[PDB]
Amino acid sequence: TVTLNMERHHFLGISIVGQSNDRGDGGIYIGSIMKGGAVAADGRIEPGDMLLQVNDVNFENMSNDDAVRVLREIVSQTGPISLTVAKAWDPTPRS
Asked: What CATH architecture does domain 1-95 belong to?
C-alpha cells in the first residue's frame, strides 16, 4: 500500500517476481526498484514489498509472476495510479 506521486506518461523501470503460494509466501513481489529518481526519490523501496496490486485493484488470485503484462498496461493507459502491496516484513526503521 503505497501512493506514488506522478508517473503516468513518464517512464518507469520496475519488475515483478514470484515463488510459490502455500503459506505466508507466494504473492508476487516487485523484483527490484531501479532506484533511479522515481521510486528511488520515494525512499529505499524493497523487492519483497509485495507490489502486486494497484489502486482498489488486487491481483491476488493473479500472481502470474507476470502481472506486469497488465500492470504495465496501467500507467501506460487506462487504470488509476496507486500501487498497492500486501505488506511484507521489511526493515523499515521509521525512515
From this structure: Roll (2.30)
